[PDB]
């Protein structure tokens, strides 16, 4: 009995240098006119070891929402490398997109993000301290994990 349905999320500019902002082309539907706003968030799981290195890259408010199909491009700056533990910098991590209505999250789209060096020299002999200016971020867009939640739509 949900008023909002997310139809598609298109990962734009992918793969890209680590420092490029995230770009997602979100398409959604709205069953009836919404009285409140939809709050979108892009969270970057910096460290798998701990949830305290998760970075909310941006939070966007979309509203008021009339009934019908809508589309928008969510832009969020790249995560702060200063908060990414060295051990978790090169390899597979997760980026999440979460929509919320009236303070309740109803959808969460997760994507595996593979950060890798592009140069053969660095791929064979990587630096002790990760060089974020030489790391390519590749969001594995062909395999998202969508999770829906039961919320109070009133």
């Amino acid at each position: 009995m949900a008023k909002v349905q997310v139809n598609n999320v298109v990962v734009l500019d992918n793969p890209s240098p680590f420092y490029n902002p995230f770009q997602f082309e979100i398409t959604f539907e709205c069953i009836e006119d919404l009285s409140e706003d939809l709050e979108w968030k892009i969270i970057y799981v910096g460290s798998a070891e701990s949830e305290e290195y998760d970075q909310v890259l941006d939070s966007v408010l979309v509203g008021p929402v009339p009934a019908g199909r809508h589309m928008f491009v969510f832009q969020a700056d790249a995560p702060n490398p200063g908060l990414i533990p060295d051990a978790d910098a090169v390899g597979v991590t997760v980026v999440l997109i979460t929509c919320t209505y009236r303070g309740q999250e109803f959808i969460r789209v997760g994507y595996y993000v593979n950060n890798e060096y592009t140069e053969t020299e660095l791929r064979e002999n990587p630096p002790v301290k990760p060089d974020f200016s030489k790391l390519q971020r590749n969001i594995l867009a062909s395999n998202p994990r969508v999770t829906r939640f039961h919320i109070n739509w009133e």
Binding site: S59, V60, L61, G63, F74
Partner: peptide, 5 residues
């Protein structure tokens, strides 16, 4: 403080 698109 949530910007608005």
């Amino acid at each position: 403080x949530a910007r608005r698109i």
